[PDB]
Amino acid sequence: KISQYACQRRTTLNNYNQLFTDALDILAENDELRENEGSCLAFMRASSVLKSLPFPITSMKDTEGIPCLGDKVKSIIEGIIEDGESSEAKAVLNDERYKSFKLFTSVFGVGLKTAEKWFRMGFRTLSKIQSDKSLRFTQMQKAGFLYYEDLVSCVNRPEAEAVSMLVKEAVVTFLPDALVTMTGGFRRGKMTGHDVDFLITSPEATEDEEQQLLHKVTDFWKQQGLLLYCDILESTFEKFKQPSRKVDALDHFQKCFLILKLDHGRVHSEKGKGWKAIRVDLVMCPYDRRAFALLGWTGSRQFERDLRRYATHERKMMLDNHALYDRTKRVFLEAESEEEIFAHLGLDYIEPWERNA
Ligand SMILES: Nc1ncnc2c1ncn2[C@@H]1O[C@H](COP(=O)(O)CP(=O)(O)OP(=O)(O)O)[C@@H](O)[C@H]1O
Ligand SMILES: [Mg+2]
Ligand code: NA
Ligand SMILES: [Zn+2]
Description:
Elements: H1 18-33, H2 37-51, H3 71-83, H4 87-93, H5 96-105, H6 112-120, H7 126-131, H8 139-146, H9 148-152, E1 155-156, H10 157-174, E2 179-182, H11 184-187, E3 192-193, E4 196-201, H12 207-224, E5 227-233, E6 254-263, E7 275-284, H13 290-298, H14 301-315, E8 317-319, E9 324-326, E10 331-332, H15 338-345
Parallel strand pairs: 4-7
Antiparallel strand pairs: 1-3, 2-4, 5-6, 6-7, 8-9, 9-10
Helix pairs in contact: 1-2, 1-3, 1-4, 5-6, 10-12
Bound molecules: diphosphomethylphosphonic acid adenosyl ester, magnesium ion, sodium ion (NA) and zinc ion.
């Protein structure tokens, strides 16, 4: 029987139901934009469970026994079976508010509030936003507009690997024992991504050395002429705090959101200016919390949400990116690997490429 939890399902990139899930993902995204959190969650859980199927839905009978498929979702599936299209998702794709929110938030530095502001000012195109002489932009948005075309072309694996080399070269210059791991979508087997994320940890670094690494690495890149954008968020990590109770848990580790200059010569692929702007995120965590951070930063977002929901509701455990706490035993559970976290939770291990929920 298919579990309602993504953490009890294997979700690989061979999606046989893309016709259904692309429509459900559009409807979920629109509900996010329309601030309808409930309808958003229902469409996300339905899309997620269909992504896990080893076969394509070809009739309504095929949906029997599948959880997270409410009556509204079943009407959408029925419509796609009928003529290969979702009339509901088609209407969202042609909606002016939806088109504007997608287009405006595609700019690095633009969120829901700024996209809503620009829409209510009557803006519909990025050309009209950029050329407006009254608008004031944040430093993040200026970088978002300046490197727009590069950031909107999604990063491929040769580029992600070339970025990994740059990150490792910079990091070991200051911490030679540091462990650097590529996380996010690329770790889950994806061919492309909007950014490249890394988890950095050191078994022998001090609390101060751990704090200074992201500043040293970004200053080195600034000197090199490779740092196009940099925002370092200092740690708010608390060694003895209980893990988050929130639906979507916040990460308190030291991190940085960057834009790097990636020279074409560094990319070893099959194939203008000779460089590409790449979004890069670096996370530094204490060595003892590396398994929890890796598990949280690997994703997918739906896999993480269901992991934390399963931990709470089924095991009376509290899980987040920093720790795992057992409310019955009144102890924090230690882990040196993701496999140990899954074993603590009573879950069969799900490989990173199986977490595409
Ligand atoms: N501030 C944050 N706190 C905790 N976890 C975060 C986070 N930002 C990102 N993540 C997590 O790390 C994974 C990577 O984040 P993102 O790069 O934003 C999406 P992705 O899974 O890598 O596909 P994508 O890079 O093409 O968008 C997420 O899927 C999520 O699990
Ligand atoms: Mg990512
Ligand atoms: Na954005
Ligand atoms: Zn990221």
